Amino acid sequence: SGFRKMAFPSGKVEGCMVQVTCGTTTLNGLWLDDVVYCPRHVICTSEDMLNPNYEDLLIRKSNHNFLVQAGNVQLRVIGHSMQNCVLKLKVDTANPKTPKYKFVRIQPGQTFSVLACYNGSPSGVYQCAMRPNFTIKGSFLNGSCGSVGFNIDYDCVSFCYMHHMELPTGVHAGTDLEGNFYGPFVDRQTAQAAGTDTTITVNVLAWLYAAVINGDRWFLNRFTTTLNDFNLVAMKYNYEPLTQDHVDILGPLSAQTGIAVLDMCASLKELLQNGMNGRTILGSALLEDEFTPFDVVRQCSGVTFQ
Amino acid sequence: SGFRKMAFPSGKVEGCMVQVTCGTTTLNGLWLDDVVYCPRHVICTSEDMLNPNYEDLLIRKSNHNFLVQAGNVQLRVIGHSMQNCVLKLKVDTANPKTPKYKFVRIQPGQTFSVLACYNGSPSGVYQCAMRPNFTIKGSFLNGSCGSVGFNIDYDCVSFCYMHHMELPTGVHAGTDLEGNFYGPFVDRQTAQAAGTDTTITVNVLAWLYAAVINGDRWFLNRFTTTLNDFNLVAMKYNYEPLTQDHVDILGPLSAQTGIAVLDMCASLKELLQNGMNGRTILGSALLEDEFTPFDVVRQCSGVTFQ
């Protein structure tokens, strides 16, 4: 028993991290086979930032301008291309530590592990969610660009995020590994702001089920509610609408605990209207929304990876 | 910016995890050089548990009774010994992936990363603290015994915990890697209970400094307080006494933020007496105590590891 914000083991990803230096900018890159992936704003300079034309900036570069260090071995660039907002630097050596991998573009509400890195060296690992407003609440300092987010599925690494910038509210914005930003953000220094966020309702319900599995039950009740009547309460408290598909996904957890999904919704309803009244759930005094139904099942059942 | 419960990168430890099977019991072991370390209660059987004599139980074993699998390669045991509550199984192959390492016995209040494992395969990584009552609030299911906790310091892994059991309150108890339990616990099935815990005061102050570094300031005040007068309030709310040594350790954080340590204590004092009044600190509605002063400096400054 017990329930923790758990990240995936990071080893498979650590073996892919490299340092990319161009001009006065240094950041991280991801070395898979003979390609290094990194944010395209590495070719920018501190005066280019204002409104750059990356196509013009890249045609002006030569391979030898890209300094790629994999630990203490310095990788020679033999080619370069740009796909949306990522650079792909082709190197003459394939990474022998390349895991089985996929590039996947995730939906808001889904979670992933972030391996934060500086100068090609990992600093730490933690679990994030993609907020409904397509930011992530990370921990990122100067130099962390090119750090990736990922999930693991048995032996395969699914890369889903690479870090590009921080927004004025202190939240973070980035792309998928094919370089498409999550949300409306652009790799241009302009007025950009996160936009209104909401709470990930299906995840809160998942976490309440986690609580029941682990022996917290003070928040349950005999009441029920309808999907419609629940969603009317959710909107009042800035929660995402709950879909029938969400209800279906919460099926196994409902079956393991014997608490019908719509009964758990009646419990959330009362928690939203009454607060928690000095009590805690799974060591938290707030309703937690960065655990998916999959995360809960995974941790409460013991799935592993090779 | 941002502040997260961050674990160390787990790669160095993942390469050491193995499966140890003896009789009807399966659990994890730690393979460093030509030795596999694992909890001695693997030699127990479901009727031995009541009050075992491990010296008698071990003299009765042969090397071939110990089934050690390192992935898909099955390690031959050539010797076995017992050091306190751990077994050391000597194998005929040295782990080529053995990191630089040390075994260290930590103080309560110190934090570490746990790589949770089943059948020799890692499942996830998260950050724990050693509670003042020498338990840890982990996430552990059947089969997780032998999972380790660790810190990293540049390139060296300092192993500090191996998992043995769960206590009736759902918290966890274990040993250092030399097999000495943390706290009064014994690897015997009897009436054992955690005992009263307290909040790690110096860590709460560290986390308040983290908050200031990251732009949360609503809890500050112009007041101050004396060490003595602070400790009188701490005791009322079941907080650990703050020592002058704690104050000294909080020195750099005090210097970076310009908030004298005793001023931050006056802030904690008011938070304890008034609660948070609907507000949050670093996304938490509770005072958080599982970040050390070192953890805060590390994450707010960008230290890395190879």
Question: What letter would DSSP give residue A244?
Answer: H
Pair B294, B153 in one domain: no
Pair A10, A108 in one domain: yes
Query: Which of these, B106, B84, B87, lies nearest to B27 by C-alpha position?
Result: B87
Rounded distance, CA A38 to CA A27, Å?
8
Pair A228, A108 in one domain: no
Resolution in Å, one decimal place:
1.9
Which residue in chain B has the smallest CA separation from A139? B2
A145 is catalytic: yes
The range of the structural domain enclosing residue A134 comes to 1-14+100-197
Pair A5, A121 in one domain: yes
Pair B92, B134 in one domain: no
Query: Which of these, A240, A244, A251, lies nearest to A204 by C-alpha position?
Result: A240
- The active-site residue out of B16, B22, B38, B41 is B41
Tell me how close the Cα of A49 comes to any Cα of chain B, in angstroms. 20
Rounded distance, CA B146 to CA B143, Å?
9
In a domain, A273, yes or no: yes
Rounded distance, CA B38 to CA B58, Å?
14
How many residue pairs from chains A and B have C-beta atoms closer than 8 A?
161
- The active-site residue out of A22, A41, A85, A172 is A41
Provide, as residue numbers in chain A, all residues whose Cβ is less than 8 Å from the Cβ of B299.
123-124, 139
Query: Inter-chain contact B139–A284, Cβ cutoff 8 Å?
Result: no
Residue carrying the six token digits 């009263």: B196
Query: Inter-chain contact A121–B285, Cβ cutoff 8 Å?
Result: no
Angle formed by the axes of helices A227-236 and A261-274, nearest 10°: 30
In a domain, B189, yes or no: yes
Provide, as residue numbers in chain B, all residues whose Cβ is less than 8 Å from the Cβ of A304.
117-119, 121-123
By the 10 Å C-beta count (0-12 exposed, 13-18 middle, 19+ buried), B40 is classed as: buried
Pair B93, B107 in one domain: no
Structure tokens at B296: 């805060």
Structure tokens at A131: 């907020």
Pair A168, A118 in one domain: yes
Pair B6, B135 in one domain: yes
CATH number for the domain harbouring residue A247: 1.10.1840.10
Q: How many CB atoms lie within 10 A of CB A288?
A: 22
Please give the tally of structural domains in chain B: 3
Domain boundary among A50, A82, A99: A99
Rounded distance, CA A164 to CA B190, Å?
54
- The coordinates were experimentally obtained by X-ray
- The active-site residue out of A117, A145, A160, A265 is A145
Domain boundary among A197, A219, A239: A197
Pair A74, A172 in one domain: no
Pair B128, B34 in one domain: no
The overall longest dimension of chain A from CA atoms, in Å, is: 69
Domain boundary among A174, A197, A220: A197
Query: Which of these, A130, A172, A164, A171, lies nearest to A145 by C-alpha position?
Result: A164
In a domain, B34, yes or no: yes
**CA distance to A124, A154, A160, per residue, from A9 (Å):** 11, 11, 16
In a domain, A306, yes or no: no
CATH number for the domain harbouring residue B19: 2.40.10.10
- B8, B151 in Cβ contact below 8 A? yes
User: Distance between terminal CA atoms of chain B?
Assistant: 23
Provide, as residue numbers in chain A, all residues whose Cβ is less than 8 Å from the Cβ of B305.
121-123
In a domain, B306, yes or no: no
Query: Inter-chain contact A118–B170, Cβ cutoff 8 Å?
Result: no
Pair B4, B128 in one domain: yes
Backbone angles phi, psi at A111, to 5 degrees: -110, 165
Backbone angles phi, psi at B268, to 5 degrees: -55, -45
Structure tokens at B274: 């008034």
For residue B111, the SS3 value is strand
In a domain, B27, yes or no: yes
Query: Inter-chain contact B137–A2, Cβ cutoff 8 Å?
Result: yes
Provide, as residue numbers in chain A, all residues whose Cβ is less than 8 Å from the Cβ of B283.
137, 286
- A79, A71 in Cβ contact below 8 A? no
Question: What letter would DSSP give residue B51?
Answer: S
DSSP assignment of B117-180? EETTEEEEEEEEE--TTS-B-----TT-TT-EEEEEETTEEEEEEEEEEE-TTS-EEEE-TTSP
